[PDB]
Amino acid sequence: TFRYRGPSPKGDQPKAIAGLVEALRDGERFVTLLGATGTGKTVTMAKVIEALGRPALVLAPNKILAAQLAAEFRELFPENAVEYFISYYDYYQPEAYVPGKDLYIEKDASINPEIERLRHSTTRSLLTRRDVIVVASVSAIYGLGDPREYRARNLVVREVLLERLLELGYQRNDIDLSPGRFRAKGEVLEIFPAYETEPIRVELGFVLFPATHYLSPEGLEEILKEIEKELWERVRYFEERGEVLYAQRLKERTLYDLEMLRVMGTCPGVENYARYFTGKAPGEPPYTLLDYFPEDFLVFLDESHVTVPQLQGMYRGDYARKKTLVDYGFRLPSALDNRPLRFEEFLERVSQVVFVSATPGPFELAHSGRVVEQIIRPTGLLDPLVRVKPTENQILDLMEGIRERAARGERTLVTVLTVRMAEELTSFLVEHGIRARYLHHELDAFKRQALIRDLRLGHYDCLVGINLLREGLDIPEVSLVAILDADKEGFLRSERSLIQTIGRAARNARGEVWLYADRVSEAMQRAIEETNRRRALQEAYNLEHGITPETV
Numbered sequence: 001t002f003r004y005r006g007p008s009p010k011g012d013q014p015k016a017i018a019g020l021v022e023a024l025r026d027g028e029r030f031v032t033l034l035g036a037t038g039t040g041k042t043v044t045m046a047k048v049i050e051a052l053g054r055p056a057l058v059l060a061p062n063k064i065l066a067a068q069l070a071a072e073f074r075e076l077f078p079e080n081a082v083e084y085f086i087s088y089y090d091y092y093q094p095e096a097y098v099p100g101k102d103l104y105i106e107k108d109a110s111i112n113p114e115i116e117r118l119r120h121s122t123t124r125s126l127l128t129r130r131d132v133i134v135v136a137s138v139s140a141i142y143g144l145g146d147p148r149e150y151r152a153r154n155l156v157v158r159e160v161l162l163e164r165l166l167e168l169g170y171q172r173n174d175i176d177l178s179p180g181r182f183r184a185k186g187e188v189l190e191i192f193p194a195y196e197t198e199p200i201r202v203e204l205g206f207v208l209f210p211a212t213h214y215l216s217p218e219g220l221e222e223i224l225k226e227i228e229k230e231l232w233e234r235v236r237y238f239e240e241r242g243e244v245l246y247a248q249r250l251k252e253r254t255l256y257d258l259e260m261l262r263v264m265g266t267c268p269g270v271e272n273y274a275r276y277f278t279g280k281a282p283g284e285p286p287y288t289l290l291d292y293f294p295e296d297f298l299v300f301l302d303e304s305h306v307t308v309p310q311l312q313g314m315y316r317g318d319y320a321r322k323k324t325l326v327d328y329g330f331r332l333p334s335a336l337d338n339r340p341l342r343f344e345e346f347l348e349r350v351s352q353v354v355f356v357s358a359t360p361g362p363f364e365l366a367h368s369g370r371v372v373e374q375i376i377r378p379t380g381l382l383d384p385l386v387r388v389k390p391t392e393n394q395i396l397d398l399m400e401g402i403r404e405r406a407a408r409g410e411r412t413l414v415t416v417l418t419v420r421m422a423e424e425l426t427s428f429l430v431e432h433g434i435r436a437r438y439l440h441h442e443l444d445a446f447k448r449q450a451l452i453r454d455l456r457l458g459h460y461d462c463l464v465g466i467n468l469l470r471e472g473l474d475i476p477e478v479s480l481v482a483i484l485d486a487d488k489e490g491f492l493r494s495e496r497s498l499i500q501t502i503g504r505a506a507r508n509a510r511g512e513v514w515l516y517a518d519r520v521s522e523a524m525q526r527a528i529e530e531t532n533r534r535r536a537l538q539e540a541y542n543l544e545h546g547i548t549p550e551t552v
C-alpha cells in the first residue's frame, strides 16, 4: 500500500489516471500513456501505482532520467520504498578487449560503496515490502544471482553467529569498515549490512540479508570442478588452433579465479561464472532483477519510443562486447550466459506494461490494447506556434530572432544536421554579438548537462547542436527553437523527433518553433498538425477554466 503525498492531479492527469487504471484492472497487458511534455507524467504514473497497490519497476532510457525519476518518486511517496537500481556500467569501466589495438581493459575496482549499496537496498526492500517502486536504466536489466538463495540466506536477531556472517558474503576487516564487512575486536560485533549507511553494533532487532547477489553455492568444490572442466576443453580449442597466447591467457586467469574462490568463496568478476552458481543451462536466460519482484509487479517503460528499442538491442550489443573477450581467451564461453535478456525473454518475465511517451513508437502502437493521452498541462502552458520559413537568408533571420529574444531575457535552441554547420554557425553567432555555445556530440553526461545547466542559469543565450533530444533542455526561458534543414531525411528530422524537438519550446508563454525549409516534408506536415492539435485543445481548456498562460 502506497501513501501518495504529492500535488493533487490537475489538467488531463485525472482523466489519464483512471482509464489507465481501468485498462489495467480490466486485464490489458499493454497500455500506453501518450503524454505531451510538461503534462506531469511522473505524477500520473505515481497515482496509477498508488491505485493498483502493486510493487513497480520504472525503466528509463538513461542514468540521468533514472536518477531524476527516483528523486521525484521519493518526494511523492516519502513513506514508501523508492529504490534506484543503479548499475556499475553507468559510471565505471567494465572489463573489455579491443582487437584493434590489442589493448585489454580491466573493470574498475574499489568502486564507490553507494553503487552496491543502492542495489542491495533494492533487492532487500523487494523481499520485505510490497510498497516498493524501483527506478532503473534499461541497462540495469542484466544477469543477477539466484533470488531463492538470496532469500533463504538471512540472519535473524550467539557465537556461531559469526559462521553465518560469512556464509552471507560478509568479509573480515577490523581495520577499516565497509558496507558488507564485519568488525569483531572482542565480545562486540559491528555488522555493516550491504544495504545500510549505518552499521549495527551488537553486544548483548533486525534481519540481515546477504552481502552479495552471487553468494557461495551448493557444491562450491563441485562447482569449481565443472568450471575447470570447461577451462581445459576451451584451452584445447585454442591449442588446436595454434593460439597458444589465448590458451595461456585463459588458463592463468581462470586458475587464478578458481584459487580465489577456493580461498574466499568469491573473486573479482565473479558474475562471469553466474550460470555455474545459478545452475542454469547454457543459452538459458539468466536470473535478473525481474525475478526479485513479486509475480504481480507492474512495469513502466518511460520514454518508450527510446526504451523499447534499447530493450530490443541490449542482447546483441552485450554479446558483441563479451564474444570478443571470449574469442581472445580472456573469458570462458560460459561468461556469455551472464547477459541482458532478449526482448522476448523480457516480455516473458513481465505481466502488464505501461508505455509512457509523447511520441509512442511502433511497438507500443501495434500492441497496446488501450492508449490514454494527457495533453492539457497542469500549468496551462500552450504548445508553441510553429512557422515554416525560407532557407534564403535563414541565418540573418535566425540571428535577428535570437538577438531580439536575448534582449528581453529569452533563450534560443538551434539544431543543425552536421558538425561543420554546428561549428560554423556557433562561431558566426558569437562574432555577431550573441552569447552562443556549441553542444558538441562528444560531450558526456553531466558535462553535457553542465553546459545545459549554464543555459538554464542564463550564462549564455543560445545553444547550438545537432541532437537536441538531450536531458535538461526544458527551460522556461527558452522561447525559440530553430530547426535548420527541417525537411531533410534522417532520424533527427523524423515526425517523432520533430515533435520531441518542438516540445523544447513548450515551457514559455511565447514559445515558437521556426522550421527552415523550402518544402514541407510529410514529417514536418504531421508534426505541425500535431502541435496545432495540442495547442488548440489546451487553449480550449484554458478558456473554459479561465486560465491565461504565464512563463514563470
Ligand SMILES: CCCCCCCCO[C@@H]1O[C@H](CO)[C@@H](O)[C@H](O)[C@H]1O
Residues within 6 Å of the ligand: 232, 233, 235, 236, 239, 240, 241, 242
Ligand atoms: C588439454 C590440453 C590439450 C593440448 C593438446 C594440443 C594438441 C595440439 O593440436 C594440434 O596442433 C597442431 C599445431 O601445429 C595442429 O596442426 C594439429 O592439427 C592439432 O591437432
Ligand SMILES: CCCCCCCCO[C@@H]1O[C@H](CO)[C@@H](O)[C@H](O)[C@H]1O
Residues within 6 Å of the ligand: 407, 408, 409, 458
Ligand atoms: C528591449 C529592452 C528590454 C529590457 C528588459 C530587460 C530585462 C532583463 O531581463 C532580466 O535580467 C535579470 C538580471 O540580469 C535576470 O535575472 C532575469 O532573469 C532576466 O529576465
Ligand SMILES: CCCCCCCCO[C@@H]1O[C@H](CO)[C@@H](O)[C@H](O)[C@H]1O
Residues within 6 Å of the ligand: 528, 529, 532
Ligand atoms: C498547419 C496545420 C493545420 C491543421 C488544421 C487545424 C484545423 C483546426 O480547425 C480550426 O478550428 C477553429 C476553431 O477555433 C476554426 O475557427 C478554424 O476555421 C478551423 O480550421
